[PDB]
Amino acid sequence: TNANDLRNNEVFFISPSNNTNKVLDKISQSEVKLWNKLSGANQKWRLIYDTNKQAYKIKVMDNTSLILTWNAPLSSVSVKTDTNGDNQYWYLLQNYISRNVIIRNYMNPNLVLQYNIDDTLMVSTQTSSSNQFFKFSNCIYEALNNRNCKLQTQLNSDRFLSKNLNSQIIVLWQWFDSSRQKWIIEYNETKSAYTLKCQENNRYLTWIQNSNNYVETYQSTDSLIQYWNINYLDNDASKYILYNLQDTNRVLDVYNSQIANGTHVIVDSYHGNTNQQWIINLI
Ligand SMILES: CC(=O)N[C@@H]1[C@@H](O)[C@@H](O)[C@@H](CO)O[C@H]1O
């Protein structure tokens, strides 16, 4: 799959190459360690690419906004407040075939991240050894791919993404365990984004581009209007935003933040308010 590629603004588990069941874990306000995978937000990391530097910040997703930091001149690493220090940027360089990634410090590219036998991390000069190789797993792909899901608006604990009765228009409706409100989320390798298929009619969540900008269930198409970048909120891994591939500045949105059964769901410019936030759970 290409779902685990080192994309800007994607969120990952970062594992030692020798153990996919251990992940980089922010255990305290400053310390990181490899730990058994638990999928808490303190084990999730957002990549933020700096084009000028051709290097990334690696930000924990537990709400603290702290970033992976080499404690120069020492050999230790920590999470610290982002002060845009050169020691807070990392080159992420991938072996295309093995999928292993080297995490090399920007301030001193002689130094790479290394995991130790005792699960601690440090920086070190480069060897040929597996203790300096990491694998990246996209969190959302791991959790949601090929799963039957419900999508609740942040606006109301009992309002869900639902195909309307006797229409293709997609609306908010209270839960009644309907196949109209159940969506199979499937990653499409060609578009590098997701489709969401309504269980009731086997048609897909799709931006219908006219003055209304409603989403409807629509037949399978190659057009970008049917594909969605599902991401966590910038600093909250408990909520999602769905950006449409036809215009990635536009997102799945509840019309006028209304909560009434039948309220139109639309595609609208991103602003990040609660009517654009979705709680996705497995059925
Ligand atoms: C904060 C908020 O609700 N903004 C909504 C916007 O997201 C979109 O739904 C639009 C539809 O025309 O109406 C606005 O009031």
List the domains of the chain with CATH numbers: 1-138 (2.80.10.50), 139-283 (2.80.10.50)
Contact (Cβ atoms closer than 8 angstroms) between residue 98 and residue 110: no
H or E element, residue 90: strand 90-94
The amino acid that residue 160 corresponds to is F
Q: Which residue has the tokens 């399978």?
A: 220
User: Which residue among 211, 268, 277 is best mutated to probe the pocket of ligand 1, counting the most ligand atoms within 8 A of its Cβ?
Assistant: 268
Strand partners, 130: none
Contact (Cβ atoms closer than 8 angstroms) between residue 102 and residue 112: yes
DSSP secondary structure letter of residue 140: H
What are 48's two structure tokens?
A: 């933020």
Ligand 1 atom nearest to CA at 266: 9
Cα 222 from Cα 226, distance rounded (Å):
8
Closest CA to 145 of 206, 194, 190, 218: 194
Contact (Cβ atoms closer than 8 angstroms) between residue 249 and residue 270: yes
- Using a 6 Å CB cutoff, which residues line ligand 1? 253, 255-257, 266, 268, 273, 275
Closest CA to 69 of 55, 46, 85, 54: 85
Contact (Cβ atoms closer than 8 angstroms) between residue 271 and residue 249: no
Cα 42 from Cα 26, distance rounded (Å):
5
User: Which residue among 251, 253, 264, 276 is best mutated to probe the pocket of ligand 1, counting the most ligand atoms within 8 A of its Cβ?
Assistant: 253
Peptide bond into 73 cis (omega under 30): yes
In a 10 Å sphere around its CB, with 0-12 CB exposed, 13-18 middle and 19+ buried, how is residue 49 labelled? middle
- The CA-CA-CA angle for residues 75, 79, 84, to 5°, reads 95
DSSP secondary structure letter of residue 265: E
Centre of ligand 1 from the C-alpha of residue 258, in Å: 9
DSSP string, 180-235: GG-EEEEEETTTTEEEEEETTT--EEEE--STT-BEEEE---SSGGG-EEEEEETT
Closest CA to 107 of 90, 77, 131, 86: 86
Centre of ligand 1 from the C-alpha of residue 64, in Å: 29
Cα 59 from Cα 66, distance rounded (Å):
6
Most distant CA atoms of the chain, gap in Å: 66
H or E element, residue 144: helix 139-144
Task: Kindly report the protein residue whose alpha carbon is nearest to atom 9 of ligand 1.
Answer: 255
Contact (Cβ atoms closer than 8 angstroms) between residue 90 and residue 104: yes
DSSP secondary structure letter of residue 264: B
What are 43's two structure tokens?
A: 């084990």
3-class secondary-structure state, position 179 = helix
Centre of ligand 1 from the C-alpha of residue 213, in Å: 12
Contact (Cβ atoms closer than 8 angstroms) between residue 136 and residue 14: yes
Cα 232 from Cα 279, distance rounded (Å):
10
Cα 16 from Cα 129, distance rounded (Å):
12
Centre of ligand 1 from the C-alpha of residue 279, in Å: 18
Centre of ligand 1 from the C-alpha of residue 206, in Å: 19
